[PDB]
Homo-oligomer: A and B are copies of this chain.
């Protein structure tokens, strides 16, 4: 068994990073809970609701064929061939694919499905590259791209009277190409000269702050760093005794997260962050925690996950998920589910239009060319009361929540909502405090 297979009149493809990118030679690494098991389980949860929804796809049951990305393009590409296993001879009629976490993977997959006119909806890929609806015409993303985020950041930088900014992107996909967007959006706009562009892959981190203070005029540092990388730049900057000198503008990797802010409260004070308009799905919380080994067979990775989540093998007991006093939930679950809904709403819209009782031959063609024309024109309330739609390029419109960290008053300890970015920039300057 190399996958999860739920049977249904129509089947939805799944690609999740269940396993981390293993070392050189070894294809799959350790299991990754929050990013692979959680997001995975979210789809299963989402499909459950759809299949139980009497108002949506009332006579057409949805199936699942979730597969392991293993955080590798080549791996997910060969893994995607099963979403085409029907085209050669119970046969699976894959109708669309819940696109992968990780753009470099997502592109690799958005290449076979493009050829088989299979439409795809990612939940995590934000690389501005994927917005080329010509190179990737069947791809669409339920998260917005980093370009929107960058324009938002340029908008905030522009509105505070900063024409000398600095960038600091974590070496990798998310970091580099996102900071590039900013660069280009800065070039195209007014030209808020970028002093330095530091690319970070704690001795080295102290050199980063040393290289940044090299341009002491560069007040503001635009950050596109991984979760710990922010924490390790801050600690480096506090060590550099640089409290309230730097003007942090953080990407969505930062957001309203207090974890990179522990002990780093003084230096981080007044940092600006853009978190996508997100909310936590209330129903799904009671679900994931419910899952035992005896009941949750569905998840063909759950015994593997169980041995890791609790660190065990002896492991006899199912009530164990109560042990999470060190480990909490996972964000971006709202998106996964929504992508699954974006598919289910499109299919249901395709049904009342072409069908008969249910799943007619007139639609059956596995022509996602018409379904793509439906996924794109899909505009409904999502799993958290946040609208779900796409532009002509297939990226979801970027609606954000600009936050700023404050410490002064006991009426202000934490992230304050400085403004929003629907597409026009909303930013309050009396509510701001550095």
Chain A residues near B (Cβ < 8 Å): 77-78, 81-82, 84-85, 87-88, 108, 111-112, 115-116
CB of A310, distance to nearest CB on chain B (Å): 32
For A108, the closest partner residue in chain B by CB is B115
B-chain residues with CB within 8 Å of residue A115 when the two chains form the complex: 77, 108, 111-112
Say yes or no: A88 contacts B82, CB within 8 Å.
yes
Total identical chains:
2
CB of A25, distance to nearest CB on chain B (Å): 12
Seed contacts A81-B81, A111-B115, A112-B112; 13 additional CB < 8 Å A-B pairs: A77-B115, A77-B116, A78-B84, A78-B87, A78-B88, A78-B116, A81-B84, A81-B87, A81-B88, A82-B88, A85-B88, A108-B115, A112-B115
* Bound-state Cα–Cα, A200 to B342, Å: 47
For A89, the closest partner residue in chain B by CB is B2
B-chain residues with CB within 8 Å of residue A78 when the two chains form the complex: 84, 87-88, 116
B-chain residues with CB within 8 Å of residue A81 when the two chains form the complex: 81, 84, 87-88
B-chain residues with CB within 8 Å of residue A87 when the two chains form the complex: 78, 81
B-chain residues with CB within 8 Å of residue A77 when the two chains form the complex: 115-116
CB of A72, distance to nearest CB on chain B (Å): 14
* Closest CB pairs A-B (n = 8): A78-B87, A81-B88, A111-B115, A81-B87, A81-B84, A82-B88, A77-B115, A112-B115
* Bound-state Cα–Cα, A81 to B87, Å: 8
CB of A137, distance to nearest CB on chain B (Å): 14
* Bound-state Cα–Cα, A131 to B49, Å: 50
* Bound-state Cα–Cα, A108 to B117, Å: 13
CB of A67, distance to nearest CB on chain B (Å): 10
B-chain residues with CB within 8 Å of residue A88 when the two chains form the complex: 78, 81-82, 85
* Bound-state Cα–Cα, A88 to B108, Å: 17
* Bound-state Cα–Cα, A108 to B112, Å: 11
* Bound-state Cα–Cα, A355 to B87, Å: 37
CB of A408, distance to nearest CB on chain B (Å): 56
* Bound-state Cα–Cα, A115 to B77, Å: 8
CB of A68, distance to nearest CB on chain B (Å): 13
B-chain residues with CB within 8 Å of residue A82 when the two chains form the complex: 88
CB of A66, distance to nearest CB on chain B (Å): 15
For A115, the closest partner residue in chain B by CB is B111
B-chain residues with CB within 8 Å of residue A112 when the two chains form the complex: 112, 115
For A78, the closest partner residue in chain B by CB is B87
